[PDB]
């Protein structure tokens, strides 16, 4: 029930790269674990976004 929250946040990231977004979601599909690691990558690159 925590992984689905990460699915919601990454899927609703405002200005994420669509190819990178599919990679974050696909990594959340292959292994529902590491939910904090993928959200960390998403927040890391979103903070560097233009």
């Amino acid at each position, epitope marked *: 029930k925590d992984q689905q929250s990460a699915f919601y946040e990454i899927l609703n990231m405002p200005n994420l*790269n669509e190819a990178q977004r599919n990679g974050f979601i696909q990594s959340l599909k292959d292994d529902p674990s590491q939910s904090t690691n993928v959200l*960390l990558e998403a*927040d*890391k*690159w*979103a*903070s*560097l*976004q*233009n």
Partner: antibody
Amino acid sequence: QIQLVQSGPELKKPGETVKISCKASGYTFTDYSVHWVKQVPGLKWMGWINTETGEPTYADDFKGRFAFSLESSASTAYLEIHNLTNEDTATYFCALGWLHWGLGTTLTVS
Amino acid sequence: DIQLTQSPSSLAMSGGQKVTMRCKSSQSLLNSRNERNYLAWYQQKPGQSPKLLVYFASIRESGVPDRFIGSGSGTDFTLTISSVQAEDLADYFCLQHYNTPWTFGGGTKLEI
């Protein structure tokens, strides 16, 4: 591997113009901004440039003689300083945001 | 503008002992969107470019030894070296990237 490489050291006489390049590799260049930092021999943030649109945003202390530009076909950011003075003598860094810093370029005005 | 006031500018070390450096911001660096504190710690050796040690206040960067420990939230942040080694003799400074005018800490020189 994310890598930033800058141009070599520069020796300039006062009043001239210097242009510093910064070649990037290892990531999508157009998605993440490039920032410029000045290190006097602390650290002072100069500004950033939008990699997608090319629009630069300068700090208050760098609004006059400084200009940021890009060559997207080569993934290279540029820093141009006009009318060089003695205070411009410093090491200039291009940085992929807060993540990765460039190797640096030492400018000496004399 | 957000101002960064670091801890001391110099520190004398005895090999193995713990060293703590502090970074206080005038305003909170915690982003309500992702609940991250937009502050990073960097190590810079003479004649070399700064290296990222900790990002998002307390998250250690890949490749950094686990003795470099960043912590804190809001306005008070600290970078801790559990057992200072000989290869850690360098300058350290914090950086806030919450607002557009990025500001840097004064710098911390680690020497014997």
